[PDB]
C-alpha cells in the first residue's frame, strides 16, 4: 500500500507543483505530464525489469559452470584409464586438446561475453539511475602530431 | 513400471537442442558473411570487427551443445517419463530460443556491418542490439537447465 | 511462391482428410470410435505441462527477438545520418526484452509447480492432476502467444520511432506511449496465466 | 624445423601449462589419498579403502608421465623459438 | 493484408532506414529561400553547403557555371542510388532495375539513330545517362552495324523483353525514332505496373497511384502536343498506356480529340485532373500544364513516404531528387541569366 | 573501475581461468614498452592492449569469486575444513553395508540427523562440487545472490542521483523524485532481500 | 485400433518440433546473396 | 494384431517418401534454363 | 461425479480470449503506430488527435482480459463440462470478435491518419468509424459475458 | 435421456454467429474506412455522407448479435441434441451469410465512395447496391431465426 | 430406429443452401458494383440500368433462401436419414450451383457495364448472357426442389 | 522380451545422418562452385584457393559418414529399443546440424570467394567464418558420438 | 514368427534406391546440358570437354542401380523384418544421397562450363569440384552397402 | 526422371543446334545418357518383378 502511496508524488505532482509555482510567478502543462508519466513508468517498470537483468549474474555464472563441468567431464576425465602407460600418454594428448578448448570456449569467447553483459548492466541499469543527459567532446589544442 | 516410449521423448530433446541451435547460428552466420563480404571490399580494415555477429552466433551454437550434452548424459533406459518430458521441454525450449536468437543475430549483423562501414559511430549500437539477442538466447539455455532438476 | 504453394497444399489436404474421416465415422454410425476424452486422458498430463512451459518461454523470446531485429535494422540504417538515435531509441529493444521477461518469469513460476504423479491407470487417478496439467498448458500457451504478438508489435512501432526521430528529435517521447500499450497487452496475458494456475496442484 | 616462432612460442606456453597442471593433479591425489574422486574407478567397487589409495597413486604416475611428454615438447619448442 | 510489416525489414530494413535518412536531407522550403537570396553563383555554393549538398564544386574550375552544378547534382544522386542498388537483394533489386530501365530506354534510343547514322559506340557512350551503364559487350564494338546492336540488345540487354513491340530491325528503320521510344516506354510502364501489382501488398497500393498518374499524364500531354504534328490518331492511341484511369473510357475521346478544349473536357470527368487544367491558367506570365503536373507528381512522391514497408519509397526517392536537381539548376540558371523575377518557378519538395 | 570487474568476476567466477586471464594481461604489460614504441596496425590487438589494465583487474576479481565458489577448472579448493557431515555417524544411523545396495543408488545425506552440521570455513563446502544435486543447492544460492546484488547495485545508482540533485539545486527532483522513487524500491525490493536472509 | 497412446503422443511432439524446423528452414532457404559488390 | 504399428509406419513412411518425390519432381519440372544466350532469338 | 478433461475446454476458452484479443490489439496498434509516425514527420500538430486509435486497440486487449479473467477465476477441477463449454464459447466469442474489431481498428486508423494528414477535417469521421469497431468488440464481449453466466 | 456433450454444438453456434458477423462487418468497415479516408481528402464535404457503408457493415454485426443472443438464451444442460443442431445451423447460417454480405458491403462502399466523389449522380446507385447487400445479410438472418425456433 | 446425426446432415443442407448462395450473390454484387461505380464517371445516365446484374445476383440469393426455408420447415427430430441425405444434397445442389452462377453474374456484369459505356449496343447482349447465368442458377434450384421432396 | 520393430529407429538414424549431411555438403558445394565459376574467370590465380568452402563442405559429408557407419555397425535384430532411440537421435543430431552448417558453408563460400577477388584481404576472413561453420558441424558430431554409445 | 507386410519395406527400398538417384542424375544431366548448349554456340571446341558432368551424373545413377539390384536379389517372402528395415535404409541412403549429389553435379557443371567458355583455366577447378560431388555420391553408396550386408 | 532430362536437353539442344550445327552430336550423346537412365529403371523392374 505504501509503495502505491508514493506513486502520486512521482507520477503527477511534479508537473502539478510546477504549474502552481509557474502561474504564481507569472510551461506546457500537458506535455510535462506526458514526460513525467513516462519517466514514472520507466522507473517503476524498469526496476522490475532491471532486477531481471541482474539475473544475468546467475545465468552466466551457471552457464559458465556448466561449460566447465561438462568440458572437464567429457574431455579430460575420459582420458584417464587404469592402464598406466596408456593413461599417462592419453592424458598428454587429451589435456592438450582440453586446454585448447578451455581457451577457445571460456577464456576467449565466454570472457568476452561476460565482458559485454557486465558492461550492459553498467550502461542500462546502473547509469540510467543517475547518469543522464549528454555533453560535448572536450577537444583542446594539443601537440598530437608527434610521430 | 516404466511406461514404454518414455525414453523416446527424452532422446528427441537432446537432438532438438543441438539441431535448432545450429540452424539459428548457421542462419546468423550466413547473413553476416554476406554483409561482411560486401562491406569488406571497400573497407577491409573493418574485416576483423565484422566477425563479432558470427562469434555471437557461435555462442548460440554452444548454448545448444550444453543442453544436448546435459540431456544425453542424463538418459537411461528405465526412464520414468516424468523426467523424459522435462528433458524434451529443455531441448525444445533452448532450441527454439536459440533459433530465434540466431535469426536476430543474422539480420541485425548484416545491417550492422553495412551501417558501421558508412557510420563508425554505429559500432557500439550494433554490438548492443546483438548483445540483447544473446541475452535472450541465454534465457533459453537457463530454462533448459532449470528443468533438469524438476 | 513454391513454398507457399507447398504449405497450402499440405494445409488443404490435412483438413480435407479430417473432414472425410470425421463425416465417415458419423455416416457409418461408429460407436464414437474417435473419442476425444480418450485422447485427452491417455495423453499424459506431463506432456501438456512441459509443452506449455516450453511454449511460455520459447514463444516469448521469439516475439522479442522478432521485434529486436525489426527495430535494429531501422535504427542502424537511419543512424548513418542520425547517430543520435542509439541514445534514446534503444528503449524500444528494452521493451522487447521486457516482453520476453514477462513470459520468462511465468515460465519459471509455472515450471516450479511441476511434480511427478507416481500414477498409472487414469481411472479415478489424478483427477486434479488432469486439471492442473491442462491449466498449466493453457497458462503457458496464453502468455507465450500473447508475448509473441506483442514483440512483433513493439518492433513495428519502434521502427517508426527510429525513422521519425532521425528527422525530428521532438517526436521520440510522444511515440513512446504506443510501445507502452504494447507492453501492457503482454501483461494482460500474464494476468490471465497467473489466474489460470492460481489454484493448481501437481502430484 | 622452424614451424614459425609464433607457433613455437604457443607450444612453450601449452607445454608449461601441461607440466604445471599435470603435476599438480598428481599431488592433490597423493596428499588426499579428496573431493574430485575421479581416478577412473571400477564399477564393481568393493569395501576396500586401500583401493582408493592405490588408484590415486596410479593417477599421480599417469599424470607425471603426461608431464614428462610436455617437458619434451617444451624443450623442443624452446630451441625453435630461440633459434628463430 | 498481413503480407507486409513482417518480412520486409529482414533484408530491406537497412535500406528503408537509409533512404528515409537520405530523404531527411532534401532541401526544405527554408533552404530554397536561402538559395534564392543569393544572386551570385559563389554565394549559391556557400549557402548550399549548409545542407547535405555541397563540397562537390571543390577542386573544379574557379569560374562557377551551370553545367558544373547540373552535372555534379546528377552525379551525387546517381552515386547514392548505385550504393543502395548494390547493397540490395533480388526481392527489392528487381524493383530498382525498373527505375534504371527508364534511363536505359533513353540511352538505347541514343545507341540506335547514331548506329543508323554511322556513329561509333565509343562516341555515343559518353552522352548516355548514368545507370544505363551497359557493362555488357556485344552492344559495344557493334562495328556501326544496326543488326549487331539489335542482336546484342535481344541477348544481353535486360530491355530485350520490351523490344518485342519494335522488332526485326525493319521496325527500327521504318519507325520514327520518337515513336520507337514512346512505344518502348509504354512496354516498360505496362510491365513495371504489373510487377508492382504482383507485389500485391503495401507497395502495390503505395506505388501504383503514382504510375497510374504518369500513365494518364502521358495521355493528356501527348494528345495536346500531338495536335500540331503529323501523326495518325490511331497511332497516337497506340501510345496510350492502359495502366491508368483513362483506359476504361477516356482515351477514346483523347484519341479523337483535335483540340485543347476537347482534352480538358475529358479531364472534366476526373476531378483529380480537372483541377490541374484549371490551375494551368496558361497566361502570358503564369504557370502551364506541365508545371501543374510536376507539382502533383511531387505531392504524390512526398505522400509515398507515409508508408514504411514498401518499395515505392525508393522510386519516389529517385524521382523526388531528380526534381530537386531541376530546382537547384533552375536557381543557378536564373542567377546566371539575371532573371530574378522568374526565380519562383521551382517545384517545392516540402 | 571496481564495479565492472566485480560484475564480471561474478559472471566469470572461475578461479583457474581467472589466473590465466591475468597472465594474458601481464604478457601485454610486460611488452608495454615494446608495443607502445612500435607500429600496431592490428586494431583488435591495440584494443585489448589498451584494455590490458582492465583485463588484469577483471581477472583479479574473477579469482576472488572463483576461490569462494571453490571452482578451478571444476576443481574444488580443499582447506581441510569440510565438516559438513560425519560419514562414520551415517553408517551408525541404521545404514549397515549400504555400499552393497549403493551399487545401484546414490542416497542423499540427510539434514539435522543430530550428527551433521557446521558451515564450511570459507566459501561453498567443497563436497557440493562432486554432488549430483549441486544443481539445486548451489544454483539456488547463486540465484538469490544475483537478486541481492542486483537490487543493491540499483539502490546505489539511485543514491548517487541525490548528489546530482544537490549539485544542480533542484529540490523538486528529490521532493517528488528521489524520495518517492527510493520509497517504492525499498518497500518492494529491499523487503524481498531481507526475507531471503 | 489405429493409434496407441504412445504413437499419438509421439506424433504430437513430432509435429510441434517439425513446425519449428519448418519455420527455421523457411527463412534459411529464403536467403539471398549479393548480385554485385558496391565498389573497389 | 499390432495393426496400429504397421499402420503408423506405412502411412507416415510412404507419405514422407511420396512427398520427397513430389517436391523433387516439382523442382525438376521448373528447372530454369536461363532463358538467354539463344532463347531470346528463338523467342 | 465431475468427469476428467472437462476443464480442458474452459482453459482453451480463457486462453483463446486473451490471445485473440491480443492479436487484434497488436495488429491495430502496430498499424496505427506506423501511420502516426509517418504523419508526424510531415506535421506533428496532429499527433495528439491521432492517438485515439491506439487506445481503441488496447480496448480490444482489455475486452479479452475481462472474459479471460472471468473464466480463469471460474476454472476449477470439478467442472460439470457444461460450464466448460460455456467458457469455451465465451472465450472464443470475445477473442475472435475482438480480433476482427482490432483488424478494423488497424486498417481504419492507419488510413484515417493519412486522411487527416492531408485534411484534418476528417478527424471526427475517422473516430466515428473506429466507434463501430469498438461496438463490434463490445458485441463480442456481451455475448461472452452472457454465456459465462448460463 | 439425452446424450452427453450434446450442448457442444449449441455453444459453437452462438459463438460462430457473432464471430463471423464481426468478421464480415470488420472487413466491410476496414475497406469502407480506407476508401473514405482517401476520398474525403479531395472532397471533405462528403465526409458526412460516405459513412453510410460503414453503418451497413454494423447491420451485419447486429444480425450476428441478435442470433448469437437468441441462441445463448436457449442453451441448457439437458439439451435434446436435435435442438443443438438447429442452433448450430442457425448460428452458421447467419454468421457465414453475414460474412459474405459484409464482403460485398466493403467492396461496394470502397468503389462507390470514390466514384461518388468523381460522380455525384452515383450516390443513389451506391445506396441501392448497398441495400442489396443488406438484403443478402437478412436472408441469412431469416433462415437462422427459422431454425433456432424449429 | 432413427439414426442419430441424421438431423445433422439435414440441418447442414438448409444452412449450406443459404450460405453458398449468399457467397455467390455477394461476389457478383461486389464485382458488379465496382464496374458500375467506374462506369458512372463517364456515363452517369446508364447507372440505373446497370443495377440489373446486382438484382440478378439477388435471384441467386433467393434461390438459396427458398430451399433453405423449405428444408428448415421440413426438419424434424424423427428423421429417417434417407430424407436427411436428400436435404443435404438439395442444399448443396442449389447453394453451390448458385454460387458458381454468382461469379458468372459478377464477371459478366462488370465486363458488360464497362463495355456498355462505350458500346450501348452491348446492353442486350449483357442481359442475354446474364440470363444464361440465371438459367444455370435455376437448374440447381430445380434439382434441389426435386430432392427435398423425394 | 524385446519390443518388435525396434530396429526401425536405429536404421532410420544411419540413413538420416548420411542423407542430411550429403544435403548440407551438396548445398554448400553447389553454391560455392557457382561462386567459383563466376569468380575465377576474372581471377584464375584464385582458383586453387576458392575450393576451400567445397573442401569444408566435404567435412560435413564425412561427419555424416562417420556417424552413419557408426550407427549401422551398432544395429542388430534383438535391439532393446532404448538403444534404437539413441541411434536415431545421434543420426539426426549430426545430420541436421551438418545441414545447418552446410547452408553456412554455401552462403559464406559464395560471398567470400567473389568478395576475395574484389578484395584479396578477405581471403583469411572467409576462412575464419567458414571455420565457425565447421565448428558448428563439429558440435553435431560430438553429440551424436555421445548418444550413439550411451 | 515372420511379421506379415514385413517384405513391404525391403521392396520400397529397392525402388527408392533407383528412383531418387534417377531424379538426381536427371537433374544434373539436364542442368549441365543446358549450359553446354549455350557454350557450343559461343564456341564448339569445348563440346567434348563439358560433357564430363553428364558422364559423372550417370555414375550416380549407377550407384542407385547397383543397390536396387542388390536389394532385389536379397528379397524373400520369409523375411525376418530386421533385414527388411536394413534394405529400406540402404536403399534410401544411396538414393537420397545420390539425389543430393545429382543436383550438386548439375549446378557446378552448368556454372563451370559457362565459365570455362570464357576462361579455359577454369577447367581444372571444375574437375576438382565435380570430384567432390562424386565423393559425396560414393559415401551414400558405402553406407548403403554396409547396411544391406549387415 | 528420364523424361525431364530428354525434354530439357531436347529444347536447349535443338535450338542450340540451329545456332551451332556442331552441337548435334553432343545433343545426341546427352540424350543417350537420359535413355540409359530410363533403361536402368527398366532393368531393375525386370529383375525385381521376376524375383
* d(C-alpha G38, C-alpha E15), whole Å: 14
- Residue E233: closest CA among E257, E269, E204: E257
**Helices (H), ranges, G1-40:** 5-29
* d(C-alpha M16, C-alpha M24), whole Å: 12
E311: exposed, middle or buried (Cβ count in 10 Å: 0-12, 13-18, 19+): buried
With touching defined as 3 or more inter-chain CB pairs under 8 Å, the answer for chains A and C is: yes
Q: Which residues in chain E touch residue B28, judged by CB atoms under 8 angstroms apart?
A: none
- Angle (deg, nearest 10), helices E8-23 and E66-86: 160
A50: exposed, middle or buried (Cβ count in 10 Å: 0-12, 13-18, 19+): buried
- Angle (deg, nearest 10), helices E312-336 and E8-23: 20
Put simply, whether G2 touches H (Cβ < 8 Å) is: yes
Residue I67, CB-side half-sphere exposure with 13 Å CA sphere: 44
Counting runs of H as helices and runs of E as strands, what totals does chain A give? 7, 0
Q: Where are the domains of chain H?
A: 1-43
Task: Label residue K81 left, alpha or beta by phi (over 0 means left) and psi (-120 to 50 means alpha).
Answer: left
* d(C-alpha M143, C-alpha M132), whole Å: 17
* d(C-alpha B118, C-alpha C82), whole Å: 12
- Residue M69: closest CA among M30, M25, M15: M15
* d(C-alpha F5, C-alpha F65), whole Å: 11
Q: What is the DSSP letter of C81?
A: T
Put simply, whether H32 touches N (Cβ < 8 Å) is: no
Q: What is the DSSP string of I45-102?
A: GGTTGGGHHHHHHHHHHHHHHHHHHHHHHH--SS--SHHHHHHHHHHHHHHHHHHHHH
Please check whether residue C63 is in contact with residue C149, taking contact to mean a CB–CB distance below 8 angstroms: yes
Does an H or E element contain N33, and which? Answer: helix N23-49
∠ CA L95-L99-L103, nearest 5°, is 170
Interface with B, mutate which of L106, L132, L148 (most B CBs under 10 A): L132
∠ CA F140-F144-F146, nearest 5°, is 115
State how far residue C114 is from chain B, nearest Cα, in angstroms. Answer: 7
**Who among B95, B104, B122 is closest to C68 (CB)?**
B104
Q: Considering its fold, how many domains does chain G have in total? A: 1
Helix, strand, coil shares of chain E, percent, nearest 5, are 65, 0, 35
**Cα-Cα-Cα-Cα dihedral sign, residues D35, D39, D42, D48:** negative
Cβ separation J26–I142 shorter than 8 A: no
Q: What is the DSSP letter of M80?
A: -
* d(C-alpha E82, C-alpha E74), whole Å: 12
With touching defined as 3 or more inter-chain CB pairs under 8 Å, the answer for chains C and K is: yes
Q: What is the DSSP string of F61-100?
A: HHHHHHHHHT-SSS-----S---S--HHHHHHTT-SSHHH
Interface with J, mutate which of I128, I129, I130 (most J CBs under 10 A): I129
**Who among A50, A102, A118 is closest to F11 (CB)?**
A118
With touching defined as 3 or more inter-chain CB pairs under 8 Å, the answer for chains J and K is: yes
Put simply, whether G5 touches H (Cβ < 8 Å) is: no
Q: What is the DSSP letter of A131?
A: -
Q: Which three cell numbers stand for residue B137?
A: 538466447
Which structural domain range is residue D29 located in?
A: 1-84
Helix, strand, coil shares of chain J, percent, nearest 5, are 80, 0, 20
Put simply, whether L3 touches H (Cβ < 8 Å) is: no
* d(C-alpha E222, C-alpha E206), whole Å: 26
Torsion angle of the four alpha carbons F119, A55, C149, C174, in this order, in degrees rounded to the nearest 10: 140
State how far residue H43 is from chain N, nearest Cα, in angstroms. Answer: 10
Mapped onto helix, strand or coil, the DSSP state of residue J42 is: coil
Q: What is the DSSP letter of D44?
A: S
Put simply, whether E154 touches H (Cβ < 8 Å) is: yes
* d(C-alpha C123, C-alpha C100), whole Å: 39
* d(C-alpha L128, C-alpha B32), whole Å: 12
Q: Which residues in chain N touch residue M51, judged by CB atoms under 8 angstroms apart?
A: 26, 29-30
Q: What is the DSSP letter of A12?
A: I
Can you give E109-132 as a three-state secondary structure string? HHHHHHCCCCCCHHHHHHHCCCCC
Q: What is the DSSP letter of I130?
A: H
Please check whether residue C155 is in contact with residue C183, taking contact to mean a CB–CB distance below 8 angstroms: no
Beta-carbon contacts of residue E59 (< 8 Å; ≥ 6 apart): none
Cβ separation J41–I115 shorter than 8 A: yes
Mapped onto helix, strand or coil, the DSSP state of residue G29 is: helix
* d(C-alpha C134, C-alpha C114), whole Å: 12
**Who among F10, F160, F180 is closest to A10 (CB)?**
F180
Residue F163, CB-side half-sphere exposure with 13 Å CA sphere: 8
Q: Which three cell numbers stand for residue B4?
A: 514404454
Q: For residues L27-46, b (16+ Cβ closer than 10 Å) or e, as one string?
A: bbbbbbbbbbbbbbbebeeb
Cβ separation B38–L122 shorter than 8 A: no
Contact partners for chain H, using 3 or more CB pairs closer than 8 A, are C, E, G, L, M, N
Put simply, whether H26 touches C (Cβ < 8 Å) is: yes
E144: exposed, middle or buried (Cβ count in 10 Å: 0-12, 13-18, 19+): middle
Interface with A, mutate which of F25, F180, F185, F188 (most A CBs under 10 A): F180
Put simply, whether E82 touches G (Cβ < 8 Å) is: yes
Torsion angle of the four alpha carbons F164, F169, F175, F176, in this order, in degrees rounded to the nearest 10: -70
Please check whether residue C162 is in contact with residue C89, taking contact to mean a CB–CB distance below 8 angstroms: yes
Q: What is the DSSP letter of F115?
A: S
Cβ separation B107–C72 shorter than 8 A: yes
Interface with C, mutate which of A44, A124, A125, A131 (most C CBs under 10 A): A124
What distance separates the 2 farthest-apart alpha carbons in chain J? 67
Q: What is the DSSP string of chain F?
A: --HHHHHHHHHT--HHHHHHHHHHHHHHHHTHHHHHTS----HHHHHHHHTHHHHHHHHHHHHHHHHHHT-SSS-----S---S--HHHHHHTT-SSHHHHGGG---PPPS-SSS-----SSSS-GGGGG-TTHHHHHHHHHHHHHHHHHHHHHHHHHHHHHHHHHHTT-THHIIIIIHHHHHHHIIIIIHHHHHH-
Q: What is the DSSP string of chain L?
A: ---TTTHHHHHHHHHHHHHHHHHHHHHHHHHHHHHHHHHHTT-GGGTTTTTHHHHHHHHHHHHHHHHHHHHHTT--SS--SHHHHHHHHHHHHHHHHHHHHHHHHHHHHHHHHHHHHH-TTHHHHHHHHHHHHHHHHHHHHHHHHHHHT-
Place of cell 462528403: J46
- Residue J150: closest CA among K73, K2, K71: K73
Beta-carbon contacts of residue N50 (< 8 Å; ≥ 6 apart): none
Does an H or E element contain B36, and which? Answer: helix B6-40
Please check whether residue C70 is in contact with residue G36, taking contact to mean a CB–CB distance below 8 angstroms: no
Q: Find the closest chain J residue to K53 by CA distance.
A: J129
Contact partners for chain I, using 3 or more CB pairs closer than 8 A, are C, E, J
- Integer CA distances (angstroms), M122 to D82, L33, L43, M112, in order: 45, 11, 10, 7
Please check whether residue C51 is in contact with residue C59, taking contact to mean a CB–CB distance below 8 angstroms: no
Q: Which three cell numbers stand for residue J142?
A: 431469416
Please check whether residue F153 is in contact with residue F103, taking contact to mean a CB–CB distance below 8 angstroms: no
Beta-carbon contacts of residue E26 (< 8 Å; ≥ 6 apart): E320, E321, E324, E349
- Residue J103: closest CA among B55, E244, I70, K22: K22
Place of cell 528515409: E20
Rounded to a whole number of angstroms, the CA Rg of chain E reads 21
Q: Find the closest chain C residue to K5 by CA distance.
A: C26
Please check whether residue K49 is in contact with residue K9, taking contact to mean a CB–CB distance below 8 angstroms: no
* d(C-alpha M63, C-alpha M57), whole Å: 10
Q: Which of residues 70-99 of K touch J (CB under 8 A)?
A: 72-73, 75, 77
* d(C-alpha C43, C-alpha J141), whole Å: 41
Count B/E contacts: CB-CB distance under 8 Å. 12
State how far residue K72 is from chain C, nearest Cα, in angstroms. Answer: 21
Please check whether residue K17 is in contact with residue J131, taking contact to mean a CB–CB distance below 8 angstroms: no
Place of cell 553446354: M36
Q: Which three cell numbers stand for residue M93?
A: 541412403
* d(C-alpha D1, C-alpha C98), whole Å: 58
Interface with G, mutate which of H2, H3, H4, H13 (most G CBs under 10 A): H4
Specified resolution (Å): 3.9
Q: What is the DSSP letter of A108?
A: I
Q: Which residues in chain L touch residue M131, judged by CB atoms under 8 angstroms apart?
A: none
What backbone phi and psi angles, to 5 degrees, belong to D50?
Answer: -60, -20
Q: Which three cell numbers stand for residue L74?
A: 551398432
Amino acid at each position: 500500500v505504501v509503495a502505491m502511496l508514493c506513486v502520486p508524488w512521482m507520477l503527477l505532482f511534479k508537473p502539478l507543483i510546477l504549474r502552481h509555482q509557474y502561474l504564481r510567478k507569472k510551461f506546457d502543462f500537458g506535455d510535462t505530464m506526458v514526460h513525467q508519466a513516462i519517466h514514472t513508468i520507466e522507473y517503476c517498470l524498469g526496476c522490475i525489469s532491471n532486477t531481471a537483468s541482474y539475473l544475468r549474474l546467475w545465468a552466466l555464472s551457471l552457464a559458465h559452470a556448466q561449460l566447465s563441468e561438462v568440458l572437464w567431464t567429457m574431455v579430460i576425465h575420459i582420458g584417464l584409464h587404469v592402464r598406466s602407460l596408456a593413461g599417462g600418454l592419453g592424458l598428454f594428448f587429451i589435456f592438450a586438446a582440453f586446454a585448447t578448448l578451455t581457451v577457445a570456449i571460456l577464456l576467449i569467447m565466454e570472457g568476452l561475453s561476460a565482458f559485454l553483459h557486465a558492461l550492459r548492466l553498467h550502461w542500462v541499469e546502473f547509469q540510467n539511475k543517475f547518469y543522464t543527459g549528454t555533453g560535448f567532446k572536450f577537444l583542446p589544442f594539443s601537440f598530437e602530431h608527434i610521430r | 513400471n516404466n511406461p514404454e516410449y518414455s525414453s523416446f521423448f527424452g532422446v528427441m530433446g537432446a537432438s532438438s537442442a543441438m539441431v535448432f541451435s545450429a540452424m539459428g547460428a548457421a542462419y546468423g552466420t550466413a547473413k553476416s558473411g554476406t554483409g561482411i563480404a560486401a562491406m569488406s571490399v571497400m573497407r577491409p580494415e573493418l574485416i576483423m570487427k565484422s566477425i563479432i555477429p558470427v562469434v555471437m552466433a557461435g555462442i548460440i551454437a554452444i548454448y545448444g551443445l550444453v543442453v544436448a550434452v546435459l540431456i544425453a548424459n542424463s538418459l537411461t533406459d528405465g526412464i520414468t517419463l516424468y523426467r523424459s518430458f522435462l528433458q524434451l521441454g529443455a531441448g525444445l525450449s533452448v532450441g527454439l530460443s536459440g533459433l530465434a536468437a540466431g535469426f536476430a543475430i543474422g539480420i541485425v549483423g548484416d545491417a550492422g556491418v553495412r551501417g558501421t562501414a558508412q557510420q563508425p559511430r554505429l559500432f557500439v549500437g550494433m554490438i548492443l542490439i546483438l548483445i540483447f539477442a544473446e541475452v535472450l538466447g541465454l534465457y533459453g539455455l537457463i530454462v533448459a537447465l532449470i528443468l533438469s532438476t524438476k | 511462391t513454391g513454398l507457399e504453394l507447398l504449405y497450402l497444399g499440405i494445409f488443404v489436404a490435412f483438413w480435407a482428410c479430417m473432414i472425410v474421416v470425421g463425416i465417415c465415422y458419423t455416416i457409418f454410425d461408429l460407436g464414437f470410435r474417435f473419442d476425444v476424452a480418450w485422447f485427452l486422458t491417455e495423453t499424459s498430463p506431463f506432456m501438456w505441462s512441459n509443452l506449455g512451459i516450453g511454449l511460455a518461454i520459447s514463444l516469448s523470446v521469439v516475439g522479442a527477438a522478432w521485434g529486436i531485429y525489426i527495430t535494429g535494422s531501422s535504427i542502424i540504417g537511419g543512424g548513418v545520418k542520425a547517430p543520435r538515435i542509439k541514445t534514446k531509441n534503444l528503449v524500444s529493444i528494452i521493451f522487447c526484452e521486457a516482453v520476453a521477461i514477462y513470459g520468462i518469469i511465468m515460465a519459471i513460476v509455472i515450471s516450479n509447480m511441476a511434480e511427478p504423479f507416481s500414477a498409472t491407470d487414469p481411472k479415478a487417478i489424478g483427477h486434479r492432476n488432469y486439471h492442473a496439467g491442462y491449466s498449466m498448458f493453457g497458462a503457458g500457451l496464453t502468455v507465450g502467444l500473447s508475448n509473441l504478438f506483442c514483440g512483433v508489435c513493439v518492433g513495428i512501432v519502434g521502427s517508426g520511432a527510429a525513422l521519425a526521430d532521425a528527422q525530428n528529435p521532438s517526436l521520440f517521447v510522444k511515440i513512446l506511449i504506443v510501445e507502452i500499450f504494447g507492453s501492457a497487452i503482454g501483461l494482460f496475458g500474464v494476468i490471465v496465466a497467473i489466474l489460470q494456475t492460481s489454484r493448481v496442484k501437481m502430484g | 624445423l622452424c614451424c614459425g616462432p609464433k607457433l613455437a612460442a604457443c607450444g612453450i606456453v601449452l607445454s608449461a601449462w601441461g607440466v604445471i597442471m599435470l603435476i599438480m593433479l598428481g599431488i592433490f591425489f597423493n596428499v588426499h589419498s579428496l573431493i574430485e574422486d575421479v581416478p577412473f574407478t571400477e564399477k564393481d567397487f568393493e569395501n576396500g579403502p586401500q583401493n582408493i589409495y592405490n588408484l590415486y597413486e596410479q593417477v599421480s604416475y599417469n599424470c607425471f608421465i603426461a608431464a614428462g611428454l610436455y617437458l619434451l615438447l617444451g624443450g623442443f619448442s624452446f630451441c625453435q623459438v630461440r633459434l628463430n | 493484408s498481413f503480407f507486409p510489416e513482417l518480412y520486409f525489414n529482414v533484408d530491406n530494413g537497412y535500406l528503408e532506414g537509409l533512404v528515409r535518412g537520405l530523404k531527411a536531407g532534401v532541401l526544405s522550403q527554408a533552404d530554397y529561400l536561402n538559395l534564392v537570396q543569393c544572386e551570385t553563383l559563389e554565394d549559391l555554393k556557400l549557402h548550399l553547403q549548409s545542407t547535405d549538398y555541397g563540397n562537390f564544386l571543390a577542386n573544379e574550375a574557379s569560374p562557377l557555371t551551370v553545367s558544373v552544378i547540373d552535372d555534379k547534382l546528377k552525379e551525387k544522386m546517381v552515386v547514392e542510388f548505385r550504393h543502395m542498388r548494390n547493397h540490395a537483394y533480388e526481392p527489392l533489386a528487381s524493383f530498382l532495375d525498373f527505375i534504371t530501365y527508364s534511363y536505359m530506354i533513353d540511352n538505347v534510343i541514343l545507341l540506335i539513330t547514331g548506329t543508323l547514322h554511322q556513329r561509333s559506340i565509343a562516341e555515343l557512350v559518353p552522352k548516355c545517362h548514368p545507370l544505363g551503364s551497359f557493362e555488357q559487350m556485344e552492344a559495344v564494338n557493334i562495328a556501326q552495324t544496326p543488326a549487331e546492336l539489335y542482336n546484342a540488345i535481344l541477348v544481353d540487354t535486360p530491355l530485350a523483353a520490351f523490344f518485342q513491340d519494335c522488332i526485326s530491325e525493319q521496325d527500327l528503320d521504318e519507325m520514327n525514332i520518337e515513336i520507337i521510344r514512346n512505344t518502348l516506354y509504354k512496354a516498360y510502364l505496362e510491365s513495371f505496373y504489373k510487377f508492382c501489382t504482383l507485389l500485391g501488398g503495401t507497395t502495390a497500393d503505395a506505388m501504383c497511384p503514382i504510375l497510374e498518374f504518369e500513365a494518364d499524364r502521358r495521355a493528356f500531354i501527348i494528345t495536346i502536343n500531338s495536335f500540331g504534328t503529323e501523326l495518325s490518331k490511331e497511332d497516337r492511341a497506340k501510345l496510350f498506356p492502359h495502366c491508368g484511369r483513362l483506359y476504361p473510357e477516356g482515351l477514346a475521346q483523347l484519341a479523337r480529340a483535335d483540340d485543347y478544349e476537347q482534352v480538358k473536357n475529358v479531364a472534366d470527368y476526373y476531378p483529380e485532373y480537372k483541377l490541374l487544367f484549371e490551375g494551368a491558367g496558361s497566361n502570358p506570365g503564369d504557370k502551364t500544364l506541365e508545371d501543374r503536373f510536376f507539382e502533383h507528381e511531387v505531392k504524390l512522391n512526398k505522400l509515398a513516404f507515409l508508408n514504411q514497408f514498401h518499395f515505392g519509397v525508393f522510386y519516389a526517392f529517385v524521382k523526388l531528387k531528380e526534381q530537386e536537381c531541376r530546382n537547384i539548376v533552375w536557381i543557378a540558371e536564373c542567377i546566371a541569366q539575371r532573371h530574378r523575377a522568374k526565380i519562383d518557378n521551382y517545384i517545392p519538395i516540402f | 573501475v571496481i564495479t565492472f570487474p566485480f560484475l564480471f568476476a561474478v559472471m566469470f567466477g572461475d578461479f583457474g581461468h581467472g589466473i590465466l586471464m591475468t597472465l594474458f594481461a601481464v604478457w601485454m604489460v610486460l611488452r608495454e614498452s615494446r608495443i607502445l614504441s612500435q607500429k600496431n596496425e592490428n586494431e583488435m590487438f591495440s584494443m585489448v592492449f589498451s584494455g590490458r589494465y582492465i583485463i588484469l583487474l577483471m581477472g583479479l576479481f574473477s579469482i576472488y569469486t572463483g576461490l569462494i565458489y571453490n571452482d578451478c577448472f571444476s576443481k574444488s579448493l580443499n582447506i581441510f575444513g569440510s565438516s559438513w557431515s560425519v560419514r562414520p555417524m551415517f553408517t551408525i544411523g541404521n545404514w549397515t553395508e549400504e555400499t552393497l545396495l549403493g551399487s545401484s543408488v546414490l542416497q542423499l545425506n540427510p539434514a539435522i540427523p543430530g550428527v551433521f552440521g557446521g558451515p564450511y570455513p570459507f566459501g561453498i563446502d567443497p563436497i557440493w562440487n562432486i554432488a549430483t544435486n549441486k544443481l539445486t543447492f548451489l544454483n539456488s544460492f547463486k540465484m538469490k545472490m544475483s537478486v541481492i546484488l542486483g537490487i543493491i547495485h540499483m539502490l546505489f545508482g539511485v543514491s548517487l542521483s541525490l548528489f546530482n540533485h544537490i549539485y544542480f539545486k533542484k529540490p523538486l527532483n528529490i521532493y517528488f523524485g528521489f524520495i518517492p522513487e527510493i520509497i517504492f524500491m525499498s518497500s518492494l525490493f529491499g523487503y524481498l532481500v531481507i526475507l531471503i536472509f | 485400433g489405429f493409434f496407441s497412446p504412445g504413437i499419438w503422443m509421439g506424433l504430437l511432439t513430432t509435429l510441434f518440433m517439425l513446425f519449428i524446423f519448418t519455420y527455421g528452414l523457411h527463412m534459411i532457404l529464403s536467403l539471398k546473396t549479393m548480385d554485385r559488390f558496391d565498389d573497389r | 494384431l499390432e495393426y496400429s504399428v504397421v499402420f503408423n509406419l506405412v502411412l507416415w513412411i510412404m507419405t514422407g517418401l511420396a512427398l520427397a518425390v513430389i517436391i523433387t519432381s516439382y523442382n525438376i519440372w521448373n528447372m530454369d534454363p536461363g532463358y538467354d544466350s539463344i532463347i531470346y532469338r528463338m523467342t
